[PDB]
From TrEMBL:
Keyword Repeat: yes
Record-given protein name: Galectin
Stored SMART domains: Gal-bind_lectin, GLECT
Keywords from the UniProt entry: Lectin, Repeat
Cross-referenced SUPFAM superfamilies: Concanavalin A-like lectins/glucanases
GO terms of molecular function: carbohydrate binding; galactoside binding
Lineage: Eukaryota, Metazoa, Ecdysozoa, Nematoda, Chromadorea
Domain Galectin: 11-142, 151-278
Length: 278
């Protein structure tokens, strides 16, 4: 227990549906300088058991300096699959678990570190718990396999001021550039967000009636290939506020009425693992 941000340990939570392929569990938190272990368990129960079937047990140990991935079933654990723990007592943590048909995929600071092969049915994760020497600051889950080129309507009300669009993506490793488009009903692009890795810039621009306007670009490109990031398109009243990886990357004064931005478009060298309106 420390500064009440919320999220008390032990933190248990019930899943709406079972944990399907494409969906991701994301657990951020801060660690004290006296922390030895915390744990993440994708389990089932009975309503809530407290020791029955755990398809994916992650134990992060600062004493042993390794992340331990195991699976408790039929009363036992099995062969520990170990892996070097890149964390140091102190600093934040960023564990993100993605289910697939074949296996779990666990990634640290947005960098894949472990491909845990499914040992008992994934269909048995109905709960997840987080426990131990850790302060939890962010636990989110959801998502699906997002096909790219992506295209889809946004909600109904669309993205209007007071709403952010939250996109969790990962630029492809040998990819030169990708784009995201927030769209208006008539066709126009409200904001064209276009990280170009070749030009080492993130070009921002609007497409009005067939023709692209000026093109705003100042900004150290923060994305890195093969690494995943948290793109956030925060629609304020006078500008979008673009957030990359927790911090404001750039603002973009509206060149079009931010009301009724009801379409989304993601192209290029990128994998999309989460979309959500907020
Ligand atoms: O090709 C059209 C558009 O593509 C993007 O890469 C640029 O950022 C836009 O300003 C350009 O007009």
């Amino acid at each position: 227990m420390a500064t009440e941000t919320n999220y008390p340990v032990p933190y248990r939570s019930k899943l709406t549906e079972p944990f399907e392929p494409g969906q991701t569990l994301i657990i951020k938190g801060k660690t004290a300088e006296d922390s030895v272990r915390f744990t993440i368990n994708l389990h089932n129960t009975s309503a809530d058991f407290s020791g029955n079937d755990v398809p994916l047990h992650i134990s992060v140990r600062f004493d042993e300096g390794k992340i331990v991935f195991n699976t408790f079933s039929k009363g036992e654990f099995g062969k520990e699959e170990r892996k070097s723990n890149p964390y140091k007592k102190g600093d934040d943590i960023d564990i993100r678990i993605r289910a697939h048909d074949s296996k779990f995929s666990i990634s640290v600071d947005q960098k894949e570190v472990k491909e845990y092969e499914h040992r008992v049915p994934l269909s048995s994760v109905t709960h997840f718990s987080v426990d131990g020497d850790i302060l939890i600051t962010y636990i989110h889950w959801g998502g699906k396999y997002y096909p790219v080129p992506y295209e889809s309507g946004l909600a109904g009300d669309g993205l209007a001021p007071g709403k952010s669009l939250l996109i969790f993506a990962t630029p492809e490793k040998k990819g030169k550039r990708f784009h995201i488009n927030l769209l208006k009903k008539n066709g126009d692009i409200a904001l064209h967000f276009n990280p170009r890795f070749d030009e080492k810039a993130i070009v921002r621009n609007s497409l009005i009636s067939g023709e692209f306007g000026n093109e705003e670009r100042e900004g150290k490109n923060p994305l890195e290939k093969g690494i995943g990031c948290d793109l956030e398109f925060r629609n304020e009243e006078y500008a979008f506020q673009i957030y990359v990886d927790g911090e404001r990357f750039a603002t973009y004064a509206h060149r079009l009425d931010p009301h009724d931005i009801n379409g989304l478009q993601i192209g290029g060298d990128v994998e999309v693992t989460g979309i959500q309106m907020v």
